[PDB]
Amino acid sequence: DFVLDNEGNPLENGGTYYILSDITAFGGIRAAPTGNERCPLTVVQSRNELDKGIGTIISSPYRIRFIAEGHPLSLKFDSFAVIMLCVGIPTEWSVVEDLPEGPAVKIGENKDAMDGWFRLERVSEFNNYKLVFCPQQDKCGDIGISIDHDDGTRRLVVSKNKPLVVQFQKLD
Hints:
Belongs to the protease inhibitor I3 (leguminous Kunitz-type inhibitor) family. One of its GO terms (molecular function) is serine-type endopeptidase inhibitor activity. Keywords: Disulfide bond, Protease inhibitor, Serine protease inhibitor, Signal. The record marks 63-64 as: Reactive bond for trypsin. By secondary structure, the protein is mainly beta. It has a single domain (1-172), classed as Trefoil (Acidic Fibroblast Growth Factor, subunit A). The protein is built from no helices and 15 strands. The chain has strands spanning 4-5, 9-10, 15-21, 29-32, 42-45, 56-59, 74-77, 94-96, 104-106, 113-114, 116-122, 129-135, 141-147, 154-158, 166-170. The chain has a four-stranded antiparallel beta sheet with strand order 7-6-3-15, with no helix packed on it. The protein has a four-stranded antiparallel beta sheet with strand order 11-12-13-14, with no helix packed on it. A three-stranded antiparallel beta sheet has the order 9-8-10, with no helix packed on it. A hairpin with a 7-residue loop joins strand 8 (94-96) and strand 9. The protein is globular, with a radius of gyration of 15 Å.
């Protein structure tokens, strides 16, 4: 039950992939400021279907070489461009609770960051998966989309009736 890049090659543990969507109206996953944050700390899906996003390093704590479903995962963004103010922030994804939008996926350093692990789960292009969060050190919530205000921003939050269907493209 290996997870496969849209070239039918299994995800390398510790490798960089773009997490493309299935909705061709839509682009890759990246980071954007949202409300009163100045650094780009919210994990968003691009609206620009031509946008591959930021390549994300996908890692399991196990010594597997190949990510199979249901393995625990940590995802962090590779290097990208921020204003000089924000240089050096942590790019590993966190789910931080006690927020209006529901449990939000964030980067940087957040107080209420839920403890837990990500897993990948097949949905069936047809190399489609969804991302789940499993709290607290097997009920996991589906990472879906929450659309914003003056923005229109589709921000990743833990959504029961979620899911965002995604695929993965290896970074060369």
